Design a protein around this ligand. Structure first.
Ligand SMILES: Nc1ncnc2c1ncn2[C@@H]1O[C@H](COP(=O)(O)OP(=O)(O)NP(=O)(O)O)[C@@H](O)[C@H]1O
Ligand SMILES: Nc1ncnc2c1ncn2[C@@H]1O[C@H](COP(=O)(O)OP(=O)(O)NP(=O)(O)O)[C@@H](O)[C@H]1O
Ligand SMILES: Nc1ncnc2c1ncn2[C@@H]1O[C@H](COP(=O)(O)OP(=O)(O)NP(=O)(O)O)[C@@H](O)[C@H]1O
Ligand SMILES: [Mg+2]
Ligand SMILES: [Mg+2]
Ligand SMILES: [Mg+2]
Lengths: 308, 308, 308
DNA sequence: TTTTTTTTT
């Protein structure tokens, strides 16, 4: 959460750092989490300056070994914003964690984006309501974004819908290339003030299209790396939770399978494979999380969305 | 396990050696396993000093020929920490060996990191339980680290979870560049006191990302060499076991394949290709080990992890 | 096989020769195969002494022209130790030759080191079994050395595993710089008593690591020359067979390729490009040998290793 | 001389 001015100290020129701001960096942790070469790669830099930028970075951010008990206390610290549905929350154990990544597995008609709206509303909630209390930025590629729904879950909780719209920042994307731009813009938006949650219903979606198969292939994946990694960094510098929604290919052989292949799957700190039962009610089975036993349970898609 | 003070003998200045500590070295074996040039490359050194540092190094560490029977007795000596599952242990023949390297082959949802937590817990175990009795340092790039799980396998065995957290040292990485830093920090952490196991769930993971293809390529590989080699040295100076977890590309042609290419594969003293069957149960097929016939067998992923 | 005492004759001081022993030389052939300058370069020498050392060297070792029929008879003389597998032996025409060099081409998981263990066991065998009857010294950089396996192929043939361990001398290396040291140590070990085979699974391996690219490059190669040449000399003074195992880079362009570049390839008297089929069975294609037509054939990796 | 990346439906 910490501005580089605190690194803008101990003799570094302000100017070059101001150049650094342009590249994307804004946190002290940015350099604390900076790849060395990539910081060197900004022009208007002498490498030794990068070296001492690392010096002050290390100086204000520990990155060495720490005791297990400590990190254990940090795992106490995670506010983990609630779904707004008690029993997904019991599935997720207190809801989606702060500073992590999430996945939506589904065909269509599932309401996964609907989940994402309900989350975007509930993030404003005071922690006693299970919220994280932070402004929310939402990015949609299909443009489905439903401020109406924001007003709806606002009606579910009574905080003014105008306050709901006070947060949630929506920019319509299109390129995979635009996404990263939205990400750095997101960063600059961040250090201004605390945010709760990043949402991307369709982080996968653009890649099927900008890249028409195949090979590419690698190149397609090659960009998600550059994409997905950044997401981590954001969560790594604010604790901001991260939600990813994936369109799922049909599997063919002799089924589903998430798109974006393995490279998404490794970054995938957690996974949620959704399904449709009768009615609003839909089935939610967990995959891939250290936090949790694999399991499943139902949740409804009400006029105010996720609940019972 | 032997501090350089024992080399800090027979006339060498303490100071220059204190400079050597800074470069990374801490063991007598470090110089006993030192490349010549690289020791010379530390500043504040005259080369002849390096020469006589080799003199005392050889003086306290044999590096010449030895009888096969002797090394055979050392192969009796390997405690080889058990998995906590008897039948992987029968696959691995008494579990993962001390002072070696290991590999996790899997897609996602496999529990390979889960294996790594269970190992991190079991390392504390007395040798009769198949443990090595040593403090454990765990490094995670995806941050999945699950102290909860540590408490869990603690419940599996009853040693206090607080004791479990007494060991296992966790530092969150990010750069490939940070990794090596964590490694030297690891060394300094080592010579302080005995450790059992190094774990890295995602030693491969950062390289896909810091390096976006291609070429690079070589450079990417070029770093893993510098990385992987160090791991050996650690195991070569403490007997500390080493676990590597690799994210696996999809293979495309007309399948899986481990990432990091050949250069990982050569260092790979052993390999474990994992798969998902139904339920907690997952399939474990061995690759690439002098120790073992190639084979496979099942193991479950319980609430306390690896077992039956 | 001939000690310098036979050169320690016709008036040379014993002392200076004793100094020569220190530099590395031990055979009469050493000076018979000595570079002039390098012998002069030992201190405590007057050049004329080197001159007359050449005089006695020539005096006890012919180095002039000889008839083709004679060398043809020597090509009858090569015992060429068998693989322990009849059909590699038919590939290699009677197995690996005495006093030559060999190469392992493979990715990983190939069993090339496994071949090297099986060879190390079979060298003890009486010539009727296709062995050379000699003690075997094995050097491993990755430490994979498997005395267990020695006992295993011992079980394959029934000579006591204790006798197997009576030979095979194992020293763990690490530097490229250490290697040469192990080589001179090897020499001193040699003239003591006859040996069959030198083995180095990983003569290439250390160079990727001690030298991080590039340039270096030349320097890297520069050392292998100094390395590989010595190997020849050993084989040139004992008939000891020489086995080299090479880790193979991925080739990239628009494949494999052996590492160490051309300079290894020229010394390479022979080459064996290995591959993996199904099961224990692996594919062996010959490259680069005057002796042989280029060809390939299968061989299995049994519990007792190379065979059918 | 060094050096693999990458699923779609
Ligand atoms: N006001 C509402 N009341 C009840 N159900 C609603 C309401 N609004 C939307 N839904 C349901 O929410 C779902 C909307 O589709 P949804 O699955 O959210 O799109 P998606 O998951 O993004 N699939 P796609 O749009 O193809 O990418 C449907 O099941 C709708 O019936
Ligand atoms: N308490 C638990 N009880 C049972 N199973 C569990 C429990 N916690 C985790 N698991 C299982 O362990 C696995 C966790 O995913 P895992 O394969 O360990 O991540 P991973 O191997 O690192 N893949 P990735 O995270 O994408 O790099 C899943 O199969 C979970 O269902
Ligand atoms: N007892 C055994 N029975 C059957 N096969 C075995 C046995 N021991 C080892 N192997 C096989 O031998 C091979 C061991 O790997 P190997 O290729 O020898 O290492 P390598 O060639 O040196 N590659 P690397 O270790 O990365 O440098 C694998 O195919 C094992 O399955
Ligand atoms: Mg949706
Ligand atoms: Mg895992
Ligand atoms: Mg081998």
């Amino acid at each position: 959460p910490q501005p580089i001015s605190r690194l803008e100290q101990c003799g570094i020129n302000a100017n070059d750092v101001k150049k650094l701001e342009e590249a994307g960096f804004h946190t002290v942790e940015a350099v604390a989490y900076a790849p060395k070469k990539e910081l060197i790669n900004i022009k208007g830099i002498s490498e030794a300056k990068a070296d001492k930028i690392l010096a002050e970075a290390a100086k204000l951010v520990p990155m060495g070994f720490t005791t297990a008990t400590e990190f254990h206390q940090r795992r106490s610290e995670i506010i983990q914003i609630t779904t707004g549905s008690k029993e997904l929350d019991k599935l997720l154990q207190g809801g989606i964690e702060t500073g992590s990544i999430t996945e939506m597995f589904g065909e269509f008609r599932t309401g996964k984006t609907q989940i994402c709206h309900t989350l975007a509303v509930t993030c404003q909630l005071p922690i006693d309501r299970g919220g994280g209390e932070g402004k929310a930025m939402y990015i949609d590629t299909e443009g489905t974004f439903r401020p109406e729904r924001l007003l709806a879950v606002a009606e579910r909780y009574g905080l003014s819908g105008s306050d709901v719209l006070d947060n949630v920042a929506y920019a319509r994307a299109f390129n995979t290339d635009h996404q990263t731009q939205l990400l750095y813009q997101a960063s600059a938006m961040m250090v201004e003030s605390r945010y709760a949650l990043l949402i991307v219903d369709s982080a996968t979606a653009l890649y099927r299209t900008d890249y028409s198969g195949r090979g590419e292939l690698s190149a397609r994946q090659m960009h998600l790396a550059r994409f997905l990694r950044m997401l981590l960094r954001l969560a790594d510098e604010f604790g901001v939770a991260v939600v990813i929604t994936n369109q799922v290919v049909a599997q063919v052989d002799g089924p589903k399978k998430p798109i974006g292949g393995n490279i998404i799957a490794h970054a995938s700190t957690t996974r949620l494979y959704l399904r449709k039962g009768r009615g609003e009610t839909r089935i939610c089975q967990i995959y891939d999380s250290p936090c949790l036993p694999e399991a499943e349970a139902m949740f409804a898609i009400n006029a105010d969305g996720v609940g019972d």
